[PDB]
Design a protein around this ligand. Structure first.
Ligand SMILES: CCN(CC)C(=O)c1cccc(C)c1
Ligand SMILES: CCN(CC)C(=O)c1cccc(C)c1
Ligand SMILES: CCN(CC)C(=O)c1cccc(C)c1
Ligand SMILES: CCN(CC)C(=O)c1cccc(C)c1
Lengths: 381, 381, 381, 381
C-alpha cells in the first residue's frame, strides 16, 4: 500500500526531530509512553546546553572583535547559531502543540472526495516531501563537510588557526595541545547546531504540503457534493475549520522562528556578498561561501513558496461551488455556501511575529533591501 | 474579591492623570461633583502654563543654535517636550470623551460567557496592567534621575553649565547667582513634562488590554450561545457595537498624539544614535543616552503591540461560530452570524492622524527609515 | 433662508469657472441657453490659446538652458504652467459631465433624515467651503503679487532682466523697447494661468465636502429608518447609488489632472528646496519662494484630506444599522442592510490616472520621496 | 458583416504565432488536423534551436567580458534574448491551454445583452486590436532595421566589427572571410528572436481586450435582466465563471513570462540610460538606443494598462444590479445577486510568478527603482 508508506515518512521526521536534540514529545505511532523516558531527555538537555554555550562563546567572540572583517566573519556564523538557539527555545516551550500537529498528519482523511483523486494526491505529496527533505539534507551535509573538514586536510594529515573564524574561549586554544580538540568540539557542535533548524524547516514544509493537499481535496469535495444532504455540508465545514485551527497552531512557533530567521539571514547574505566581492580571500573558503549562499536562498525560497501556496489554495476554495447548480439549490445550500465563501475570504497566512507576512512578494522586498545594503557595504570598503 | 482590586487600579490611573496636571474630568468613583473644584483646576492651569513656557524657551533655543551638535542636542529634548505639549492640548480639548472612556472601564460586564473564563481573564488583565505601568514608571524615574541629578553631584556638593543642554532665557543664566535656581526650575518642569505623556501611554495601554479581553470574552460567548434564543444574540451584537464605538472614541485623541509622537520619536532616536556613534562624548551622558534609547524603543514597541492585538482579536472574532452547528441552525442564526462576520471583517485600527496605521509592520518600516537616516547622518559627520 | 445662500455660492463658483477661461457649460441657475453664446466662447478660446503659447515658450525655454540653475528656475514655472494646460484640456474635453455635476450640487435633498441635522450640516458645509475658497484665493493673490510686481518696483518707478526667469521668444526682449511690454504680457498671462487650476481645486474641494455631508446624512437616515416600510429603503439605496455614480463621474477628469499635478508638484518642491538651501539667492525672491512652498503644501494637503474623508465616510456607512433592532427585523431588512453593507465595503477612492490612490498616506510617501531627492540634489551641488 | 472580420484577425494572430516558430497547436478555423504536420513542426524546432544557440553564445559572451561597458552592452541584448527563450519554453510546454484560449476567442457570445451594445463593442474591440498590433509591429520593424542594417551601410556598400556588440563564437569572426556571414546569421536570428515575444504580447493584449469587453457585456446583461426568470441568471453565472476559468488559464504562462520580462526589462532600461547619459557614444547608435527605450516603455505600459482594465471591470461588475428594483425582487434574486457580488469582490489579477501583481502602480514602483539604480550607475561612472 502507498498509504502506509506515508506512515513511514512521518515516523522518520519524528525520528530526525529527536536526533538533533529537540524536546521529546509523543509521536502518533508511539503508544508505550516512550517520550517520557529519561534516556531521551538527558540527550536533549545535553545537546541544548552544548549548543547554548557554543552560541554564547561565538556571540561574545563577536563583541571582542579586532576589525570590521573579523566582525562580519563572526556575524555570519553567529546569525546561524542564534537562529538555532531561537528554534531550540521555541520547540522547548510549545511541546504540547507539536503532538496535536503530528496527530493531524497521522489521520486527515477527508470525506466526500472522489476516490480517483486521492491516489494522485498521495503520489504528489510523497514526491514533493522527498524532494525538499533530500535537497536540504544533501546541501547541509556538503556545506558542513566543506566548512569543517577542508582546513583539517591541510595540516592534520601531516601553522595555527585550524578553524576558519575564532571565538572567545577561557582556554588559550592557539597552542598545539588545545587547538585540535577545540576543532573536534567545534565539529560536533557544528553538526548539532546545523541539524536543528534544517529539521524544523523540513517539518514546516511537510505541514504546508499537507495543508495544500487538504485544501484541494476540500474544493473537489465541495464540487462533488454540489454536483449531486446536510451531513456532507457539516463534514465539509468541520474539515474547513480544522484546517484553520491547524494553521492557527502553526502560526505561533514559526512566527518567532521566522522573525529571527529572516532578519539574521538577511545579515548573513549581506556579509557573505561583501566577503565574496571585495576582500582577496584565500580561495579555500570560496566553496564554503558559495554553498552557504545557495543554501540560504533555497531555504528562504522554499519557505516563501510553501507559505504562498496555502493562501492561494484558500482563495481558490473561495471560488468553489459557484456555478449554475447553486442558483437551482435550496435556501440551505445558498446560505451555507455563502458562509463558507465569506469565511474563506480571510487568508491563511503565516506571519513572522506579526511584523511581516511570509509571501513571495516579501522575498522580492527583502532581496531589494539586500541589494541596497550590499551596495552600501561595498562602497564603505 | 479580585474585581474590587481592579477598581483600585483604575482609580489610581485617574489619580495619576490628575497628578501630572491634565484637565480634571469626572471619574466613575467620584460622585460629589469633585472634578469641578477650582483647587484642582488652578493646578492643571499652572502646570500647563509652566510646561508651555518651558517648551517655548527650548523651542526658540533650538533656532538660536551655534552649530550642528547643539542643534541636535536641542532637537532631542524639544521633540519630547512638544510631544508633551501636544498631549496636553489633546487632553484639554476632548475632556468629555475621557469620562465615557473611564465609565467603560468601570463596568464592561459581558453576558453569556462561561464563568470559568472570567477569573483567568481578570488575572491576566491585572498582570499585564501592572507590568506595563511599573515598567514605564521605573524607566522614567531612572532616566529623569540620571539626566537631571548626575551633573549636580559634580559641582553642587562642593565651572558653569550645570545643565546638559542650554536654552533661550531672558536672564543671563551663566552667572552663579542664577544658574542654580535655573537648574531647580528645570528639574521640576522636567518632572511634569516627563510625567504627562508616560501617563497618557499608560492609559492607552490599559484601554487596549481591556478591549482585547472584551473581544476574547465576546468570541467565547458566541461559541457558548451557539453550543446551546434571540436575546442572547441581541446582547452579543450590542457588546460588539459598544466595542466599536469605544474604539472610535479612542481613535481621535490618540490619532493626533500618535502622529506627533512617532515623528518626533524618529527624530530623537536618529539624533541619539548620531551622538552615541561619532562625537567623543564626555561619558557622563552615556547612562542618560543609553536609557532614553531603551525608553523610546520600549514605549513604541508596547504601543504597536497593543494596537496589533486588538485587530488580531477582531479578525479572530470573524471566525467565531463557524462550525457544524451553524449548518443545522435556523435562518435567523445563519443570518445574524453572517451579519456579525461581515461587520467583524472591518478591522479595528488606531491610525495616527490618518497618515499611517499603528501596527507592528509600521515599526519595521520606521526602523528601516531610522537606519537609513542614521547612515546618512553618520556619513555627513 | 440659509439654503438660498448655498445657491449664491455655487453660482459664484460657476462664475469663477467662466472668469478664468474654461469652456462654458450650462449652469443650473441658467435657463436661457446662455452658455452657447459666442461672447463667452471667444473669451475661453482666446485665453486658452494665450496660455498655450505662453506655456510653449516657457517649455522650449527650458531645453535651451545655460546651466543647471537656469534649468531648475525654468522647471518650477513650467511645471505649474503645464499643470494649467492639462487642466484646460481636461475641462475642454468633458464638458457634459460638468453640467451633471453642477446639477448634483443644485439639488441633493436626502429624504428620511431628522430635520434637526440638516441645519448644522448646511452651516458646516458653508463654513468649510468659505474657508478653503478664501484661503487658496488669498494665498494665490499674494504669491502672484510678490512674484510679478516686486521686481517692477525696483526699476520701473524710476539694468535689464525685469522678470525673474527668462523664456524663449522670437523677439529680442532684452532691449528697453520690448522688455516692459513683455513684462506686462507675462503679468496678464500669469494671472490667467494661476487662476485656472486653483479654481479647479476649489470646485473639487466643494464636491468632496458635499459628498461627505451627503454620506453622513445617509448614515443618519439609515439609523432613523431602522429605529422605526419598503419605500424608505428604496430611497436610501437610490441615494447610495447616486453618490457612487457621482464619484465615478468625478474620477476621470481629476484622475488625469491629479497625475499631472502630483508629479510636477513634487518636481517643483524639490527644485524650490534646492534654491532655498544652497545657492546664494538675491533675497528679493525669498518672499516668493517661501509663499510658493506654502501654497503647494496647502493645496496638496487639502486635496488629500478631502479625498480621505470620503472613503472614511463610506466605511462609516458600512457600520450603519448594525444594532439590536437588526436582529429583530424581518428577512427583508436583514437582506437589504446586508446588501447595503457589502456594497459599502468597496471604498470610494479618487485615483490619479490609476497610478496611485489619493490618500493621506500617499502624502507621507511623496514627502519621503521629496526628502530623498532633496538630499541627493543638495549633495550634487 | 463585421463579425466575420473579427474571424480574419484572430486567424492572422494564429498565423503570426506560427511564423515566428512557436509550437503549432490546433487553431479554431483549422479542421483537417493540420497542426500535426511535420512540415510546420521542423520549422518550429529549427527556429527554436537556432534561437537557443544564439542566446547561449550571447550569454557566455557576457561572462567573457573585457570591462564594464562591454558587459552592459552584452547585458541589454542578452536580457531581450533570454526573454525570447523563456517565452519559447513557456509556449512549448503549455500547448493544450492555447487551443482552449483560441477557442474562447472564436465563440464568446453573451446571451441577454441588448442588441444595440454589441455593435459598438465589436467596433471598439477591432480598433484597439489594430492599434496595439500595428504599433508594436511598426516599432519592432524600425528598431530591427536601424540596429541591424545601419552599420552595414557604412562598409558593405564599398575596418572590422560590423555588428554593434560581439559575442562568443568558436570561429574567429574578425577576419573578412567570416564576419559578413556572421552578420547575415545574426540578422536572421535577430528577426526570429525579436518576432517571438512581440507576438506573445500581442496575443496577451488581444485576450485582455476581449475579457474587458466580455465583462462590460456581462454587467449590461445583469442590468437588463434585472430591469425586467431563472435561466437568465444561470446563463449570467455561467458566463461569469467561464471568464474566471479563462483568466486562471491565462495566469500561468504569462506568470513565468512576465517575471522574466519585467526583471530583464528593468536591467535593460538601466543599462540603456547609462549608455545614453555618460559614455561618449559614436552617434550611430543613438537612433537605436532611443527606439529601444520607447519600445520597452510602450510594451510595459500597454501590458500594465490592459492588466489593470480587467480588474477594474471586475470591480465594476461588483456594483451591478444594485438599485431600487433589487429591494423589490424575490428571495431568489436577492440571493443570487449577493452570490455574484461576493464572488466578484475577488479581483481577476495577473501575477508575475506570484512575486508581484501586474498593475499600473507596479509600473510606478518599478520606475522608481529604475531611477534609483540609474542614479547609482551614473555615480559609479
Ligand atoms: C554557516 C553554518 N555552518 C557552520 C559554520 C555551516 O557549516 C554551513 C555552511 C553552508 C551550508 C550549511 C547548511 C551549513
Ligand atoms: C529626554 C527626556 N528627558 C528630559 C531631559 C529625560 O529626562 C528622560 C530621559 C530618558 C528617559 C526618560 C523617560 C526621560
Ligand atoms: C509659480 C507660479 N507663479 C507664476 C510665476 C506664481 O506667481 C505663484 C507663486 C506662488 C503661489 C502661487 C499660487 C502662484
Ligand atoms: C534589443 C533587441 N534588438 C536586437 C539587437 C533590436 O534590434 C531591437 C531594438 C529596438 C526595438 C526592438 C523591438 C528591437
Amino acid at each position: 500500500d502507498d498509504y502506509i508508506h506515508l506512515r513511514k515518512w512521518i515516523k522518520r521526521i519524528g525520528i530526525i526531530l529527536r536526533i538533533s536534540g529537540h524536546w521529546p514529545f509523543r509521536l502518533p505511532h508511539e503508544k508505550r509512553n516512550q517520550h517520557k523516558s529519561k534516556f531521551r531527555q538527558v540527550y536533549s538537555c545535553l545537546v541544548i546546553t552544548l549548543g547554548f554555550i557554543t552560541c554564547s562563546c561565538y556571540c561574545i567572540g563577536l563583541c571582542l572583535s579586532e576589525s570590521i572583517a573579523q566582525a562580519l566573519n563572526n556575524i555570519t556564523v553567529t546569525s546561524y547559531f542564534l537562529q538555532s538557539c531561537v528554534c531550540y527555545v521555541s520547540f522547548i516551550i510549545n511541546s504540547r502543540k507539536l503532538e496535536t500537529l503530528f496527530n493531524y498528519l497521522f489521520e486527515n482523511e477527508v470525506v466526500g472526495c472522489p476516490r480517483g483523486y486521492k491516489m494522485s494526491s498521495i503520489k504528489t505529496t510523497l514526491f514533493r516531501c522527498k524532494f525538499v527533505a533530500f535537497s536540504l539534507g544533501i546541501l547541509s551535509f556538503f556545506g558542513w563537510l566543506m566548512w569543517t573538514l577542508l582546513p583539517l586536510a591541510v595540516l592534520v594529515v601531516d601553522q595555527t588557526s585550524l578553524r576558519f573564524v575564532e571565538a572567545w574561549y577561557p582556554f588559550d586554544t592557539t597552542t598545539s595541545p588545545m587547538n585540535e580538540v577545540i576543532a573536534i568540539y567545534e565539529a560536533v557542535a557544528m553538526i548539532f547546531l546545523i541539524t536543528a533548524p534544517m529539521s524544523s524547516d523540513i517539518m514546516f514544509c511537510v505541514l504546508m504540503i499537507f495543508i495544500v493537499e487538504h485544501l484541494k481535496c476540500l474544493g473537489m469535495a465541495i464540487e462533488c457534493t454540489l454536483k449531486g444532504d446536510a451531513t456532507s455540508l457539516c463534514n465539509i465545514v468541520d474539515s474547513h475549520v480544522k484546517i484553520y485551527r491547524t494553521m492557527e497552531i502553526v502560526q505561533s512557533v514559526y512566527s518567532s522562528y521566522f522573525a529571527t530567521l529572516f532578519f539574521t539571514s538577511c545579515l548573513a547574505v549581506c556579509a557573505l556578498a561583501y566577503f565574496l566581492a571585495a576582500t582577496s580571500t584565500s580561495f579555500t573558503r570560496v566553496p564554503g561561501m558559495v554553498l552557504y549562499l545557495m543554501y540560504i536562498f533555497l531555504r528562504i525560497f522554499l519557505l516563501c513558496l510553501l507559505a504562498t501556496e496555502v493562501a492561494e489554495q484558500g482563495l481558490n476554495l473561495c471560488h468553489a461551488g459557484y456555478s449554475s447548480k447553486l442558483v437551482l439549490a435550496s435556501d440551505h445550500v445558498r446560505s451555507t455556501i455563502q458562509a463558507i465563501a465569506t469565511r474563506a475570504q480571510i487568508p491563511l497566512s503565516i506571519t513572522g511575529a506579526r511584523f511581516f507576512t511570509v509571501n513571495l512578494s516579501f522575498l522580492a522586498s527583502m532581496a531589494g533591501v539586500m541589494l541596497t545594503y550590499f551596495i552600501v557595504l561595498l562602497q564603505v570598503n
